[PDB]
Design a protein around this ligand. Structure first.
Ligand SMILES: CC(=O)N[C@@H]1[C@@H](O[C@@H]2O[C@@H](C)[C@@H](O)[C@@H](O)[C@@H]2O)[C@H](O[C@@H]2O[C@H](CO)[C@H](O)[C@H](O)[C@H]2O[C@@H]2O[C@@H](C)[C@@H](O)[C@@H](O)[C@@H]2O)[C@@H](CO)O[C@@H]1O
Ligand SMILES: CC(=O)N[C@@H]1[C@@H](O[C@@H]2O[C@@H](C)[C@@H](O)[C@@H](O)[C@@H]2O)[C@H](O[C@@H]2O[C@H](CO)[C@H](O)[C@H](O)[C@H]2O[C@@H]2O[C@@H](C)[C@@H](O)[C@@H](O)[C@@H]2O)[C@@H](CO)O[C@@H]1O
Ligand SMILES: CC(=O)N[C@@H]1[C@@H](O[C@@H]2O[C@@H](C)[C@@H](O)[C@@H](O)[C@@H]2O)[C@H](O[C@@H]2O[C@H](CO)[C@H](O)[C@H](O)[C@H]2O[C@@H]2O[C@@H](C)[C@@H](O)[C@@H](O)[C@@H]2O)[C@@H](CO)O[C@@H]1O
Ligand SMILES: CC(=O)N[C@@H]1[C@@H](O)[C@H](O[C@@H]2O[C@H](CO)[C@H](O)[C@H](O)[C@H]2O[C@@H]2O[C@@H](C)[C@@H](O)[C@@H](O)[C@@H]2O)[C@@H](CO)O[C@H]1O
Ligand SMILES: CC(=O)N[C@@H]1[C@@H](O)[C@H](O[C@@H]2O[C@H](CO)[C@H](O)[C@H](O)[C@H]2O[C@@H]2O[C@@H](C)[C@@H](O)[C@@H](O)[C@@H]2O)[C@@H](CO)O[C@H]1O
Ligand SMILES: CC(=O)N[C@@H]1[C@@H](O)[C@H](O[C@@H]2O[C@H](CO)[C@H](O)[C@H](O)[C@H]2O[C@@H]2O[C@@H](C)[C@@H](O)[C@@H](O)[C@@H]2O)[C@@H](CO)O[C@H]1O
Ligand SMILES: CC(=O)N[C@@H]1[C@@H](O)[C@H](O[C@@H]2O[C@H](CO)[C@H](O)[C@H](O)[C@H]2O[C@@H]2O[C@@H](C)[C@@H](O)[C@@H](O)[C@@H]2O)[C@@H](CO)O[C@H]1O
Ligand SMILES: C[C@@H]1O[C@@H](O[C@@H]2[C@@H](O)[C@@H](O)[C@@H](CO)O[C@H]2O)[C@@H](O)[C@H](O)[C@@H]1O
Ligand SMILES: C[C@@H]1O[C@@H](O)[C@@H](O)[C@H](O)[C@@H]1O
Ligand SMILES: C[C@@H]1O[C@@H](O)[C@@H](O)[C@H](O)[C@@H]1O
Lengths: 314, 314
């Protein structure tokens, strides 16, 4: 190991945001603080000087952004309430309003977050699990934090993935979330402006490890068309990818890369098949320097390859 | 799941002690409190009313006993110092003197603990990992807590298993500990009263997952003879057993039962091959009610079988 990688909590929550290839990665250290590593031409930071807040030990860690002008990072307090670390270009980091709403969730809740796509307005949807084990949506629309739609029961401690996109022929944003049900299947729920939340749960994988990590991305929104990727940790201790491709739907799935037992996962993407893309990056723990966070890369140039072997501070 | 199961921390530390088939099992709840479940002809307790103290979330949990007259449970504080919860018959539960010593360890340290075998005196050896990644022994021999022998370097965040026994032809106790080295091997170190700590590390498993759980027991101590069993979580997400049997040494090894990814493990035994024994019990998480602690059984009559599906509070 290394002294730096020794600072990364084993099975830490991981989240990532980006503006094309300007990347930020959030993780928790062994004392419970949440740190930011970055990629701006090269990898940097992730030290005790790069802490954006503190969270309960073992906390989920989720994030979303509008490019890098606005970033929000979501974690649990000691009292099991949702909280938010916020960055706005020209203000810096501050403790965001979410904490003041005091939304109590299950102690074992995960979190996902999206800014709604296709608008310059700052509109947030956050998803977590209540003590009754239902997935609850929370909303920010300029005018305070409030509860949105409840999306029903899920496996207690399920991972939660989410993405927002805007079809080019639609008048408003779409949302897709994925989570695990009590029968251990992984499923999709969906929101479109004309149908609200579709009533049906779409199974994407028949059987996954209980409480397995779940992360998702989308890219290349066209007219009634989208590309999506969903990642989870399977029973072979590897990340699997499930693919949605326009014209084929959910058509493929298979192993991507090995990880440590119980690794968390984050995914980011940019570009499109139409313009020499997409670019995909996964972050996870595969046991490099024992406890470092590693990267995986997909691009047009080389397809599937390992990336940065060990992120800062390793 | 059940409301009770849901209180149990996912990948909680687990320890157990016994007097023959009178059993106690220790685990951490989602709020960080350590709780006791018990078997006295039937399973009971494990609730918020059976809290014996509080430890940092994710803490290792270790325990040792002299029958059930004296029980000692070891965890880590928020401050990353060793602490102890103590039970003496006639006194009940109290905060033990270990915390007063303020032994600072690595944030990712595990713990093992033994009462030295074959004496009525209360002599304790505790094992943990310091910030420099060396295994340190800490000692209580009646005149306060102090540092004992340093047993050198190990994988940062290694599991630690330990046992004490006293050969019937010896006039002092023996001790064996097991842990993982930087090369991912699982090894034994050994103390006998004539050789002190043997210089050599003996390899018991070529390669195991990083920071895999490690637990050990011994039984049937005779004239320069002993039986030992060591358990860890292998890459196939099962507990594997390694056996020391008198005559054969370290001769056999294989899977026992499936567990969740990154499950912790505890072991207890009683009896011996001479007396229609031994009896073994293993505690672990295998996904029963998602987060419940499960039991595996070995006994002469029926051999290997799953035991209590879900311990209290499940
Ligand atoms: C077609 C294209 O322009 N792709 C770039 C990609 O470069 C391609 O793939 C890499 C692996 C290398 O073979 C290049 O020659 C090839 O063009 C960029 O990746 C960076 O490439 C440079 C060299 O030009 C370095 O290898 C650098 O490490 C690569 O950065 C990667 O992506 C970063 C955003 C981080 O995730 C980093 O850890 C990765 O290694 C990328 C980044 O600009 O952009 C296209 O994909
Ligand atoms: C169930 C349903 O169809 N509700 C919509 C509501 O959608 C909300 O946002 C969507 C994306 C999703 O998260 C739903 O669960 C959630 O209820 C609509 O809310 C507006 O959505 C747009 C983006 O589509 C903006 O975010 C806008 O700020 C939202 O309106 C605000 O929230 C509403 C609940 C109202 O309180 C309104 O006063 C707010 O301005 C609304 C249209 O308002 O339509 C259904 O209620
Ligand atoms: C390396 C070595 O051989 N040291 C011994 C020391 O062994 C200690 O205990 C053993 C089992 C092991 O944990 C070692 O790492 C540790 O240093 C002996 O200590 C005594 O051990 C017996 C049991 O065999 C009793 O536990 C007794 O209380 C111990 O004596 C006390 O501790 C010693 C360090 C002395 O300070 C003594 O005055 C204490 O009463 C001693 C024999 O005393 O011999 C080597 O130091
Ligand atoms: C390509 C480009 O112009 N990128 C900009 C970044 O380089 C800027 O990063 C900020 O740079 C200043 C020094 O000029 C300083 O290093 C700031 O700490 C750094 O901010 C980083 O990026 C932010 C989005 C946050 O994640 C913050 O924690 C980081 O430290 C940023 C400033 O907003 O603008 C980019 O466009
Ligand atoms: C320099 C500047 O004016 N920046 C804008 C912020 O002030 C705005 O943040 C919101 O400001 C209001 C005050 O009217 C209040 O402080 C809100 O808490 C704050 O909202 C934050 O951002 C939201 C998107 C949420 O994440 C909320 O929980 C945060 O606390 C924002 C408007 O979002 O724009 C900045 O540019
Ligand atoms: C079925 C039965 O009663 N078995 C005996 C146990 O009850 C004894 O333990 C103590 O019993 C008293 C009853 O007056 C009371 O229930 C105590 O709480 C109980 O203590 C338990 O055992 C201790 C060793 C600790 O683990 C403690 O936390 C437990 O709650 C035992 C020995 O005292 O003997 C059984 O035969
Ligand atoms: C009735 C009675 O007195 N029983 C003995 C206990 O008092 C002993 O506990 C130790 O007592 C001393 C002197 O008061 C001091 O309080 C110690 O802290 C305490 O030691 C505890 O037990 C040890 C074995 C260690 O675990 C230590 O950290 C604990 O705090 C005990 C131990 O000698 O024996 C009872 O019989
Ligand atoms: C100590 C306990 O051992 C087993 O208990 C058995 C009982 O379930 C019952 O079958 C009787 C039959 O008379 O045999 C016991 O040995 C475990 O099942 C139990 O969980 C305890 O570990
Ligand atoms: C963007 C790429 O899309 C498909 O071609 C998949 O085969 C790859 O894994 C990658 O997700
Ligand atoms: C005590 C028992 O010993 C041998 O029979 C092993 O095959 C069993 O797994 C058990 O350890």
């Amino acid at each position: 190991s290394t002294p730096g990688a020794q600072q990364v909590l084993f099975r830490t929550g991981i989240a990532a945001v980006n503006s094309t290839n300007h990347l930020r990665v959030y993780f928790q250290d062994v004392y419970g603080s949440i740190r930011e590593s970055l990629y701006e031409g090269s990898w940097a930071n992730g030290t005790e000087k790069n802490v954006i807040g503190n969270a309960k030990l073992g906390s989920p860690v989720a994030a979303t952004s509008k490019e890098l002008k606005h970033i929000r990072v979501y974690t649990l307090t000691e009292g099991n309430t949702l909280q938010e670390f916020a960055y706005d270009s020209g203000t810096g980091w501050y403790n965001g309003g979410l904490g003041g709403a005091k939304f109590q969730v299950a102690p074992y809740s995960c979190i996902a977050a999206v800014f709604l796509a296709g608008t310059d307005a700052l509109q947030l949807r956050i998803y977590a699990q209540k003590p009754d084990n239902t997935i609850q949506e929370y909303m920010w629309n300029g005018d305070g934090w409030k509860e949105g739609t409840n999306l029903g029961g899920a496996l207690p401690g399920t991972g939660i993935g989410a993405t927002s996109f805007r079809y080019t022929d639609y008048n408003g944003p779409s949302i897709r979330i994925w989570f695990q049900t009590d029968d251990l299947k992984l499923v999709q729920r969906a929101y479109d402006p004309h149908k609200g939340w579709y009533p049906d749960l779409v199974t994407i994988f028949d059987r996954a490890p209980p409480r397995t990590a779940i992360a998702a991305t989308s890219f290349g929104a066209g007219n009634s068309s989208i590309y999506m990727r969903i990642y989870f940790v399977n029973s072979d201790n590897t990340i699997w990818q499930v693919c949605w491709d326009h014209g084929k739907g959910y058509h493929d799935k298979g192993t991507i890369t090995p990880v440590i037992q119980g690794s968390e996962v984050a995914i980011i993407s940019w570009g499109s098949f139409a313009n020499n893309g997409p670019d995909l990056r996964l972050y996870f723990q595969n046991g490099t320097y024992i406890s470092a966070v590693s990267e995986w890369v997909w691009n047009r140039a080389h397809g599937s390859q390992l990336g940065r072997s060990a992120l800062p501070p390793a």
